[PDB]
Amino acid sequence: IAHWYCGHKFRHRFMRDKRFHPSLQASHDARNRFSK
Amino acid sequence: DPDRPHIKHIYNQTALARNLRYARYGYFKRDMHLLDVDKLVRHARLLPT
Amino acid sequence: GLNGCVETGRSRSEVARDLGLSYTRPLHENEKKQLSHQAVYYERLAKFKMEQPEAARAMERERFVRKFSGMFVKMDIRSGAPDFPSTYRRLLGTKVVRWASKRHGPN
Amino acid sequence: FRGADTYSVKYCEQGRYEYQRYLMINRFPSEYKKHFLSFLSNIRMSSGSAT
Amino acid sequence: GHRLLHGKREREGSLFAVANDVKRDERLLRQQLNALLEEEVPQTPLVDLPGVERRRDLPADPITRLFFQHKGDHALYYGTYDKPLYTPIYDFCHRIREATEQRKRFVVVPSTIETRGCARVMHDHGLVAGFRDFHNDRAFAVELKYFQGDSTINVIEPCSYDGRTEFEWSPKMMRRLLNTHGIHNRLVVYICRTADNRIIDHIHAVKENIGGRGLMMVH
Amino acid sequence: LKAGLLGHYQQEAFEARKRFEESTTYPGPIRAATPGDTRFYSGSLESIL
Amino acid sequence: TEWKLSPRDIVLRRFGQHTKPPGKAALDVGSMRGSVIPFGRSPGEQL
Amino acid sequence: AGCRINLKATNNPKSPTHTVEGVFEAVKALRSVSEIAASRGKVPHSLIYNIYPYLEEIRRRK
Amino acid sequence: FLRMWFLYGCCLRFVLFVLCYYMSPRLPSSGNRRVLYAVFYLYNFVWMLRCFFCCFIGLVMSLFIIEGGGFVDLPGVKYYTRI
Amino acid sequence: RWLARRFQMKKHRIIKRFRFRRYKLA
Amino acid sequence: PWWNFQTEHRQRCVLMYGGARTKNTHNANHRVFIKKYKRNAFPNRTRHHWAVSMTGVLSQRPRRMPWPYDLTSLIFNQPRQGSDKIGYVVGTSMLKTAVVATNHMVYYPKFNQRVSRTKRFFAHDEDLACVEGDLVHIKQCRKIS
Amino acid sequence: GGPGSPVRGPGYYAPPMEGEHQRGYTAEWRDLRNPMRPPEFPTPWERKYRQYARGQHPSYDMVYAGPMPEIFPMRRDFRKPTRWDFHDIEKQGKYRTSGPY
RNA sequence: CCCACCAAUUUUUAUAAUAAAAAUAACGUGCAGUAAUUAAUAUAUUUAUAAAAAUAUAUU
RNA sequence: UAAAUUAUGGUCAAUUGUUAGUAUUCAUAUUAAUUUUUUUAAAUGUUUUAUCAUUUUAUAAAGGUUUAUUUUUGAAAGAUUUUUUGUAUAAAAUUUUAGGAAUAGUUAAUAAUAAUUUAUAAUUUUGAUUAGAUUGUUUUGUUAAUGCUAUUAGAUGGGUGUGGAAAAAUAAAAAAAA
Ligand SMILES: [Mg+2]
Ligand SMILES: [Mg+2]
């Protein structure tokens, strides 16, 4: 994982990849929970 | 205005703009002084007896 | 009349038309108005053109003048693109300000 | 790297045009009409001086 | 006049005898009704061997045909074991593992097509002693195999490790499974259902140059 | 649409076609009508010439 | 006899119906460090 | 042979005793081909060798 | 990778001296380590940082070249002047 | 543990600062 | 030796342009992001940019690619991709027009799974026979609007 | 690969397929790397080459006559610019080195 | 072993009369865990130059 | 609850080194790259003509484009003649941002080229529009890896309506009518 991508820690990159997950529930949660 | 809405689909099931919960009687208790009782009866959720 | 003809490519509407059938759902009042007002407007326009010659002539001349003087009369690729704001979205904002949006339909 | 490798004898024993599987290439009816007209025109092209 | 038969229950003509319930088990009731329909006038009864409804369904093996009898409609609803969120193969592997870790003699597992095919493959490779009530269409018993204390089965894992993802194996994948880790692997058995509803192992898959959807591995 | 139900739908379509043929049958031949023209053709638009 | 039902109240969830939604099961997806391969990353484990 | 050791889950990854214990446990949990063949009822040579007569050994005796 | 924030990806930085002073190292280490204030302009923006002054005190230097360090003794600085 | 205790202490300090701000507004 | 499709693609590249792009593009170059706005005051109401962003359509990680193998490919023999479709009518508000929502397959090689995405199309009905809820089969044609 | 690419599916594992797609992916599609037999001809052009569709070469007594591998210092890449090599296109590119050696 | 303010520099977000966090060997105040001096914890409320507690439940 | 059927009348093993192919060193990388003791070489006058003219000489302005941009064609090729000769443009899938919301010269129909009309129009939480970043579709690096990490396919409305076709005012190894 390139460090310049999506912040500086690994959880940021993990959540950014999770928001592109095929499963609708996981994508929706990953893109809405922190905005909540 | 629920009786004559100027928009379509008053309610929605989005993630950050859910307004169905904000239509129950508890929220209208605050403005019960100005409340229209017929409008409350026809458009409200979890109304008591 | 529910099936298209694979050999000729005709749709179910064409098949029903050729067979003399009729598959038309019950139309609402707005749909009936849509199908009925075309003749009314055509008759109105023809009556106006035959009743007021000077006004119709002036309007037609002005319309032709603006059409002929338009900057993009030539039918090149840019004019022949079905959706100019979407296809040539690079021009929007920086050069062309006519369209504030690059997308208007389901394409 | 791969200095000496061999292939199956079937490759050199095969006959010509014996590997072409029959595939159905379907087209639009308008494409069929266009292609048929083009082929008919090419066939009917006169043998004047260049054909 | 046409009544649509929606669902496998209605296609198979379930009585729905239980009031206001369609998902209730009915095999026992149907079996007892067939027993009643049986005749006790020379009236030869029917033997307890598992039967088939059509004479053409008898096994092609002459020895196996001795264990099957041609019963018209009483052949249905066979078996004593009942059905014991996850795939049937995942459940089968979990049951086999958790019973071979408890040193049990028999494990009741749900009898699906893939499950019984995998059971037959393991029996052929010698990982299972035998079977009980194998002709049952709901569940059957796998008899575990033990030698000098420890179990014959060491590790059994389904292909869908999470129980929700399926995989299609190409012939290249089958040949790689055969030559896994640089060695010829007839030791660890990979089982895949082909496109012809046929359950085989990687050895046969690479022999006949096909693939399939993987089910589980056991060694 | 889900592709896992294609086999079941094929079976149901076969059964429906067979029932149609068995019951409705065919009540006499029908004279063939001359096909018309289709507006919807493939490719780019053609000139009016 | 009588059905005094109201589709508007049923859709608008008047009287406060509850559906008991699923929890972490749908949300969890596992570690995505690598690709999803058959039999998982570590097929079989002994403790 | 090839050996891969992962001691991240342990509280102290830099533990030589953990390393040697894990390697020895992995070696202990290993079954030989002779033991596997004895348990299965098969010939050990008909498990790792590609000879076509061995194909009869993976079928059911009929 | 939050370290080397002021390098902006380059393996070295070109800075100019402004101030010089001393800071105590983290406990239990004791002393007065010398650190210099540096200023640099990148893309029309001025930036100020603090870097350890390990260069020899020879010529009167006005500019310095800054590289990464790694010594966890000084809280706040991670940049070191090339010799 | 002590992490949670410090978290609770910080929360309590924030709450009392907010109530002090409200009193100042009054 | 059997040469993979990469060899054929490189052959095509060498034919079209003298040689192939084998220059060792420095993938290890340190990409940087220099902020220009306030901590939370990014000039956009929808998405906020705060780091280096991925570029490219088919180079996005995780990978997404078309998956032709679906119900449409099982039923119809398409002369071209997406020539024939099957869907449900989801609107007849426009005169002589039927809106149809169809499904296609997107493949994720990293997770090894496929998903059904939805697309809307403006199908044409001449005699106004389509009603909302009709399962229809639609075909490509000339440009109508 | 889609346009201009004959690759039709992933080499080893794929998401589940249905019907003829599964049949092709598991049995019918071409498989160059298969060592036992080449991709079979359509009927009836397959029964007449039954004996020739086994293995690669019948010799099994081959004596390798090429250069010996360099064990040390075991160079990785050999991108020599040539002048008369007509197989430079195939030579260039990353290739897996797995053989008898 | 060991908590909060005060004192003392300073650092970031911010330039709004903002506001907030955090790093810090010797000060001055109050007394804070480690079966530990007091059943424990959590939520909510209240007082004092703003430390410590009190009050009221829930949990174990 | 089938109860131990009996010339045991053929034992003599295995190995001959021959193959159905992703295989894993926690990192110090006999991995890739930038960084120290300062790497070089080629140029700028297209030509022809019926002479203040006419004829032949058509994408590297780079900009800031994620539902996006896709195209040779009436010239040439080209042939003892039509009579112009001659269907180029259009679709489907894939499309970025820690702190996610509305968008709009708008959708369809039309006897309407160049819409005075009709409609309960269109886009979007399955992530739109605006704003930021970035030349889109197996080309680089690395690994046991369907992982991670690169990449100038150099592409488009007011400057002349010429031309078959604008791309037409830096260059970019190119033979242009004896
Ligand atoms: Mg960085
Ligand atoms: Mg932009």
Ligand SMILES: [Mg+2]
């Ligand atoms: Mg697109």
Ligand SMILES: [Mg+2]
């Ligand atoms: Mg010509």
Ligand SMILES: [Mg+2]
């Ligand atoms: Mg988007």
